Write an enzyme that holds these catalytic residues in place. Structure first.
Site, PDB file in Angstrom:
ATOM      1  N   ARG A 169     -44.614  -2.768 -23.677  1.00 51.10           N
ATOM      2  CA  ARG A 169     -44.420  -2.230 -22.316  1.00 51.10           C
ATOM      3  C   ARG A 169     -45.722  -2.256 -21.491  1.00 51.10           C
ATOM      4  NH1 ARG A 169     -42.987   3.749 -24.816  1.00 51.10           N
ATOM      5  NH2 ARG A 169     -41.074   3.273 -26.010  1.00 51.10           N
ATOM      6  N   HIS A 228     -35.275   0.751 -26.453  1.00 51.22           N
ATOM      7  CA  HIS A 228     -35.132   0.133 -27.807  1.00 51.22           C
ATOM      8  C   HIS A 228     -33.968  -0.869 -27.831  1.00 51.22           C
ATOM      9  CE1 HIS A 228     -37.630   3.467 -29.417  1.00 51.22           C
ATOM     10  NE2 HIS A 228     -36.808   4.292 -28.804  1.00 51.22           N
ATOM     11  N   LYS A 238     -39.156   6.215 -43.828  1.00 54.96           N
ATOM     12  CA  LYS A 238     -38.975   7.287 -44.885  1.00 54.96           C
ATOM     13  C   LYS A 238     -37.524   7.542 -45.213  1.00 54.96           C
ATOM     14  CE  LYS A 238     -40.103  10.506 -41.659  1.00 54.96           C
ATOM     15  NZ  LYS A 238     -41.344   9.674 -41.541  1.00 54.96           N
ATOM     16  N   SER A 285     -38.723   7.597 -26.234  1.00 54.88           N
ATOM     17  CA  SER A 285     -38.065   8.764 -26.804  1.00 54.88           C
ATOM     18  C   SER A 285     -38.675  10.065 -26.269  1.00 54.88           C
ATOM     19  CB  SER A 285     -38.139   8.699 -28.316  1.00 54.88           C
ATOM     20  OG  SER A 285     -37.516   7.465 -28.727  1.00 54.88           O
TER      21      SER A 285
HETATM   22  N1  LIG Z   1     -52.815   4.331 -28.957  1.00 52.94           N
HETATM   23  C1  LIG Z   1     -51.717   4.646 -29.699  1.00 52.94           C
HETATM   24  N2  LIG Z   1     -51.878   5.272 -30.919  1.00 52.94           N
HETATM   25  C2  LIG Z   1     -50.834   5.643 -31.706  1.00 52.94           C
HETATM   26  N3  LIG Z   1     -49.550   5.347 -31.327  1.00 52.94           N
HETATM   27  C3  LIG Z   1     -49.248   4.685 -30.141  1.00 52.94           C
HETATM   28  C4  LIG Z   1     -50.339   4.279 -29.218  1.00 52.94           C
HETATM   29  N4  LIG Z   1     -49.741   3.663 -28.149  1.00 52.94           N
HETATM   30  C5  LIG Z   1     -48.377   3.695 -28.367  1.00 52.94           C
HETATM   31  N5  LIG Z   1     -48.090   4.306 -29.566  1.00 52.94           N
HETATM   32  C6  LIG Z   1     -46.794   4.635 -30.293  1.00 52.94           C
HETATM   33  O1  LIG Z   1     -45.432   4.630 -29.728  1.00 52.94           O
HETATM   34  C7  LIG Z   1     -44.747   5.406 -30.797  1.00 52.94           C
HETATM   35  C8  LIG Z   1     -43.233   5.460 -30.720  1.00 52.94           C
HETATM   36  O2  LIG Z   1     -42.878   4.223 -31.378  1.00 52.94           O
HETATM   37  P1  LIG Z   1     -42.582   4.067 -32.987  1.00 52.94           P
HETATM   38  O3  LIG Z   1     -43.049   5.353 -33.694  1.00 52.94           O
HETATM   39  O4  LIG Z   1     -42.968   2.662 -33.557  1.00 52.94           O
HETATM   40  O5  LIG Z   1     -40.973   4.253 -32.946  1.00 52.94           O
HETATM   41  P2  LIG Z   1     -39.918   4.134 -31.702  1.00 52.94           P
HETATM   42  O6  LIG Z   1     -39.926   2.582 -31.545  1.00 52.94           O
HETATM   43  O7  LIG Z   1     -38.651   4.721 -32.273  1.00 52.94           O
HETATM   44  O8  LIG Z   1     -40.356   4.839 -30.397  1.00 52.94           O
HETATM   45  C9  LIG Z   1     -45.527   6.733 -30.885  1.00 52.94           C
HETATM   46  O9  LIG Z   1     -45.494   7.437 -32.158  1.00 52.94           O
HETATM   47  C10 LIG Z   1     -46.923   6.147 -30.674  1.00 52.94           C
HETATM   48  O10 LIG Z   1     -47.728   6.308 -31.870  1.00 52.94           O
END
Ligand SMILES: Nc1ncnc2c1ncn2[C@@H]1O[C@H](COP(=O)(O)OP(=O)(O)O)[C@@H](O)[C@H]1O
Ligand SMILES: COc1cc(OC)nc([C@@H]2CCCC[C@H]2C(=O)NCc2ccc(Cl)c(Cl)c2)n1
Ligand SMILES: COc1cc(OC)nc([C@@H]2CCCC[C@H]2C(=O)NCc2ccc(Cl)c(Cl)c2)n1
Ligand SMILES: COc1cc(OC)nc([C@@H]2CCCC[C@H]2C(=O)NCc2ccc(Cl)c(Cl)c2)n1
Ligand SMILES: COc1cc(OC)nc([C@@H]2CCCC[C@H]2C(=O)NCc2ccc(Cl)c(Cl)c2)n1
Ligand SMILES: COc1cc(OC)nc([C@H]2CCCCC2C(=O)NCc2ccc(Cl)c(Cl)c2)n1
Ligand SMILES: COc1cc(OC)nc([C@H]2CCCCC2C(=O)NCc2ccc(Cl)c(Cl)c2)n1
Ligand SMILES: Nc1ncnc2c1ncn2[C@@H]1O[C@H](COP(=O)(O)OP(=O)(O)O)[C@@H](O)[C@H]1O
Ligand SMILES: Nc1ncnc2c1ncn2[C@@H]1O[C@H](COP(=O)(O)OP(=O)(O)O)[C@@H](O)[C@H]1O
Ligand SMILES: Nc1ncnc2c1ncn2[C@@H]1O[C@H](COP(=O)(O)OP(=O)(O)O)[C@@H](O)[C@H]1O
Ligand SMILES: Nc1ncnc2c1ncn2[C@@H]1O[C@H](COP(=O)(O)OP(=O)(O)O)[C@@H](O)[C@H]1O
Ligand SMILES: Nc1ncnc2c1ncn2[C@@H]1O[C@H](COP(=O)(O)OP(=O)(O)O)[C@@H](O)[C@H]1O
Lengths: 155, 156, 153, 153, 155, 156
Positions: F88, F19, F39, F126
């Site tokens: 990524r 991040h 939230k 994470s």
């Molecule tokens: N096919 C997918 N469906 C849902 N989420 C995805 C998919 N590929 C990657 N991600 C998302 O990467 C997320 C983590 O990023 P996000 O919640 O935006 O916050 P952070 O940037 O703090 O990790 C996971 O909750 C996940 O949902």
């Protein structure tokens, strides 16, 4: 050639214009279309209600439900064809695995795919329900009866 | 349902069991199937058309034609309202999406319907068959006998 | 040589992306055969590999006229080693291995993920950047670096 | 056991997709360790594997509390073997292996492409179809077939 | 903050509405945009002409050409940013490899991507030239001056 | 150019060097950066916000905020005309395309700009950091020291 029935399966939670585009594009290509749901935010009875309302205008479309394998539904009903939409690569790989199995389960049923139209490639039930939870406008994504039901749900 | 024609386009250089998988899965689902070939690669047009005709003459309702212009215009000329295409892989998928997006602009009355290649034939392409034939490996699992004969003679 | 792994390629030229895979394989098999077939001739490509792997005593460099799977049979190798960088590598290798298994069911292809530093390196992009006189010491071994500078100045 | 390969998984349950990879690995290493962590308990999963691999004399079944790469160290395995079926497997395995290499640079992960007959098989879809009383003899070994029919009738 | 220039590179063979959507979406986000071409169906002089005509209406857009590495162009000109579009997964993996290299070549230049709009995800120079070769209508895919040049080319 | 704000949304449970790679690459390209958090997952909102503030306090112009409604509405309230997101992998890409297609319907004045994760941090999430921390591996390559301390205490 003989009478043809195609089955369009889904959880339709709820039905969207992504779903209806495929249904509509399929009605001129088969004698009958069965929209089929197994047995989420809307109950089964509610989901069936939303579909019937949304396909009112397509007289060769039936709505049914079933608890059993999809290919066994197709077999009871005399359908030879399952129709599925594809929007993206994640759909594609998943749908490949489902069909590979369905072909083992019953090799007389074929699955045919159609590509979602440009405008609907991003819509799913999930993302519409997310937008509806923040009360943004969903009139471009779902038919009017479904719009009403979502707004009452995420009041 | 009125009379239906579906069109199966390709270069078929040469036709393989990967192409036939799709053609035999479509023959029972429409009144007629047209296999439509464009307009060098390793076999001339006339050869490619001959190989297809011999490989499909066991089916009831499969015609082999050439064209010339746009596929969608071939479909309009012939009264076909459907194009059938096989999908093997992610890279097939992305390419086919771009083509169908465009074909819908060109003629929004023609639908493109896809079927997944069977697991046994996903990896086959005209290209890899020619590769293997050039090394004189056994290619009888990959192509029908009339095509097998033609490849062997191409490659010695 | 109870066990031999074969590492095929065009190597036009060998880069540190190729060497990554070769070096990671050396400890896992009694011998490694780098097997070869552009910008550089065959003879040139083979020499660039030979010089780039001379520090690895169980690696040998050969050429073959015929199918890879027939080479493996001939030398007694039961394993082909290929590197994967990306989704496009993966799909392409899936088709090749599906066919190789049909040609000879007794040879297996094993894949290793390219290391993260070298994931973006191909012979093609090294040549392109070399044509522009970019610094290429992080992408290719010194003997290849020289050959590229000689080619492109 | 000059060489040991480790094959990790949840195996909930073991299917012929898993067995494909295990059987293809046996001839390439002195020993294979199938290493375990749902629908079935740990004890149940281990028993289903043991019974499914008893025809392969160099395969052993173990459980571990800790990192995979620490298990490999402990038993002296320098290789983890994983099967790839699809693009989504590939991306997921790329992330795991990037991290494993950080945790222990001396262990390599090697991939094999699932055979074409078994590419679509997962524990999940076998369980789903079993819940509907489908014929599952082509997807799982006989001892697992029994356990699934007992579970779901 | 300081004066900003972004560079939008391409072969523009020819420029399409896919290309112009990215250019247009970028003009409010940087002080200057340089459309840059290296050094195919249209010559360099022709391609440069098609671009200049098609971006006439965006006063902060310049059109240039260069024979050298893109990051060295950015460096001569004082640009810190390359802008690239993405339509699909094949774009994505390719663009990842290019940026990984460009970051080695010059780490002070960042590449920023924007997703093509829904309507333009399928257009490329290649497919427009294919449609133009069969003389179908291309008015939805390219600006009017480029439309004219394609039709004269595939007469 | 008038005053620009870019918004970097996420759950940050916890923030990692993956991040921060994106955040430090964006600080010089806009007047201000807002890191915007939504939230349960393993750290409370207040904890996640604290971890971010400590991990970014070395930069000049990075603020850490929560919301509540739609991201695009946060952007309108604050005068940000840009959302910045890292890519990524292919699966990130497809997901992000669906989100930006929708956000453009919601507010077509906000652009989403993407940058590719650096090769060293592509694999970090994470999720995988928490996995490894739970086994008490050395996580100092993956997260800043203040986050490293918080993970260690979560996981013993
Ligand atoms: N096919 C997918 N469906 C849902 N989420 C995805 C998919 N590929 C990657 N991600 C998302 O990467 C997320 C983590 O990023 P996000 O919640 O935006 O916050 P952070 O940037 O703090 O990790 C996971 O909750 C996940 O949902
Ligand atoms: C091809 O389209 C679908 C869609 C889908 O879920 C939407 N699942 C399936 C399954 C594929 C293999 C495993 C069992 C298969 C199944 O049949 N599960 C029951 C099922 C589901 C949905 C419906 Cl509508 C019905 Cl009637 C019955 N194939
Ligand atoms: C869906 O199937 C295919 C396949 C394909 O292969 C080239 N191209 C097309 C084209 C897509 C839009 C742009 C022109 C389209 C076209 O029509 N291109 C030539 C083309 C002509 C005529 C024939 Cl008969 C064929 Cl077989 C092939 N759609
Ligand atoms: C990021 O966007 C592009 C686009 C692209 O080709 C369109 N190539 C590059 C190359 C990436 C690494 C190898 C050299 C890189 C190059 O710089 N090749 C010369 C080049 C090309 C295009 C132009 Cl417009 C220029 Cl000025 C100069 N990165
Ligand atoms: C481009 O970046 C993101 C990221 C993301 O994560 C959930 N979701 C969105 C959503 C996409 C359209 C549907 C609602 C959109 C939304 O706004 N969802 C909640 C959401 C709210 C508020 C905030 Cl402050 C965040 Cl950080 C996150 N776009
Ligand atoms: C697994 O790695 C490779 C790589 C590759 O390069 C193109 N081709 C092959 C083949 C794909 C199956 C069809 C024949 C295939 C072949 O065997 N072509 C001769 C061939 C190629 C490369 C080498 Cl090094 C040799 Cl000795 C001999 N499998
Ligand atoms: C390469 O194959 C696997 C598979 C996999 O399953 C989820 N996780 C891992 C790991 C990914 C890196 C972060 C820690 C990882 C781990 O080591 N988690 C403990 C773990 C898991 C599985 C087994 Cl069988 C064992 Cl003994 C112990 N790499
Ligand atoms: N693991 C998965 N990968 C990709 N897509 C999935 C996965 N699981 C569910 N889906 C998708 O979620 C949606 C819901 O399931 P489905 O029963 O087919 O239809 P519907 O969207 O009509 O309710 C589908 O569009 C399906 O493609
Ligand atoms: N990314 C891609 N770009 C161009 N073609 C592709 C791609 N992926 C798959 N293909 C196509 O598969 C083709 C072979 O199919 P096609 O020419 O329609 O005839 P046939 O069906 O006889 O093999 C190759 O020419 C190739 O262009
Ligand atoms: N469709 C394809 N996708 C990916 N790689 C391909 C494709 N067609 C040919 N290749 C070649 O495969 C290469 C991997 O090459 P290989 O056959 O091992 O020789 P080398 O590694 O020396 O390039 C790529 O660098 C490229 O030259
Ligand atoms: N994001 C993901 N993509 C693909 N597979 C995943 C993902 N997350 C978890 N998995 C699991 O990885 C599995 C491969 O499992 P593994 O960890 O070897 O246990 P097993 O092979 O017994 O399932 C899939 O069957 C699935 O359960
Ligand atoms: N190997 C490849 N894989 C994917 N896309 C490619 C490849 N080679 C070229 N392209 C694409 O072809 C197009 C032409 O190249 P480029 O110089 O970036 O721009 P333009 O389309 O403006 O002329 C681009 O949109 C680029 O993404």
């Amino acid at each position: 050639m003989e009478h043809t029935i195609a089955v369009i399966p889904g959880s339709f939670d709820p039905i969207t214009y992504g779903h209806l585009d495929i249904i509509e594009r399929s009605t001129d290509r088969f004698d009958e279309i069965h929209v089929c749901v197994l047995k989420g935010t809307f109950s089964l009875e509610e989901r069936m209600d939303l579909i019937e309302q949304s396909v009112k205008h397509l007289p060769n479309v039936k709505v049914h439900q079933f608890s059993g394998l999809l290919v066994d539904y197709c077999e009871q009903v005399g359908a030879k064809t399952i129709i599925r939409g594809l929007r993206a690569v994640s759909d594609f790989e998943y749908e490949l695995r489902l069909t590979s199995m369905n072909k083992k389960l019953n090799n007389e049923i074929e699955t045919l795919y159609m590509m979602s139209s440009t405008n609907y490639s991003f819509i799913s039930s999930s993302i519409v329900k997310e937008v509806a939870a923040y009360r943004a406008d969903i009139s471009e994504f779902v038919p009017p009866y479904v719009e009403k039901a979502l707004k009452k749900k995420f009041k």
